[PDB]
Amino acid sequence: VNSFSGYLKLTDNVYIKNADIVEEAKKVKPTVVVNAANVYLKHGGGVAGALNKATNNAMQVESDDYIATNGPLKVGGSCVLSGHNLAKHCLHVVGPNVNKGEDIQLLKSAYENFNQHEVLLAPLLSAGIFGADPIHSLRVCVDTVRTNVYLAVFDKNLYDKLVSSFLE
Ligand SMILES: CC(C)[C@H](Nc1ncnc2[nH]c(-c3cnn(C)c3)cc12)c1ccc2c(c1)S(=O)(=O)NCC2
Structure with missing residues (x-):
């Protein structure tokens, strides 16, 4: 269960790996995978589109039904x-x-x-096309998350900069 491999432990509850979150989810089958979503759950590209494609569009159909009944999320x-x-x-x-x-x-x-979840596989929130400074996003993750989070960052250049920034 939750057989994460090759992560570097940054704090007692935050781990990080240079990896594609989709490939991690297939190998680990974690209890929870985090999607970097938008408020209407339209998984049009990037991380969200990759996770949806790996479900052969079942995640998009389920998401559309959720929004019809509940309305959009808040930022x-x-x-x-x-x-x-x-x-x-x-x-x-x-x-x-x-x-x-x-x-x-x-x-x-x-x-x-x-x-609200004991163990999670997640991407670096608000990074990429959402425009946040990825070093800042890792600092907010370390300061905020108290449960066990395994961060997959699909870019070796960014992984190296994040680990160097944390170990300063
Ligand atoms: C900073 C990036 C290195 C990071 N990317 C990723 N991080 C982890 N697993 C990934 N799988 C893929 C992938 C797999 N297949 N395809 C076609 C894409 C991307 C990827 C990332 C982190 C957060 C965000 C994005 C991107 S985003 O621009 O897509 N949306 C905003 C939020």
């Missing part, structure tokens, strides 16, 4: 849906998109959602 919020073939559950978390004018302070609220 900083989350919902629990099926993990399909990737995990027992998928925790869809909306980090702020600072390239769209959303407040970076909401990144603390976004990582707070992780605390």
Whole structure:
């Protein structure tokens, strides 16, 4: 169960690996995989699109049905849906998109959602096309998450900069 391999332990509860979150989810089948979602759960590209494609679009169909019944999420919020073939559950978390004018302070609220689950496989919230400084996103994760989080970062250059930044 939760057989994470090759991670570097940064703190008592935060681990990090240079890896594709989709490939990690297939190998580990964690209890929870985090999706870096938007408020309408439209998994159009990036991490969210890759996780959806690995479920052969079942995650998008389920997400559309969720939004029809419940309405959109809030920035900083989350919902629990099926993990399909990737995990027992998928925790869809909306980090702020600072390239769209959303407040970076909401990144603390976004990582707070992780605390309702004992173990999670997750990406670096608000990084990539969401525009946040990835070194800042790792600092907010370390300061906010109290449960056990395994971060998969699919870029060796960024992985090295994050580990060097943490060990300063
Ligand atoms: C900073 C990046 C290195 C990181 N990327 C990733 N981190 C971890 N597992 C990944 N799998 C893939 C993948 C697998 N297949 N395809 C076609 C893509 C990307 C990827 C990342 C972190 C957070 C965010 C993004 C990207 S995003 O721009 O897609 N959306 C905003 C949030």
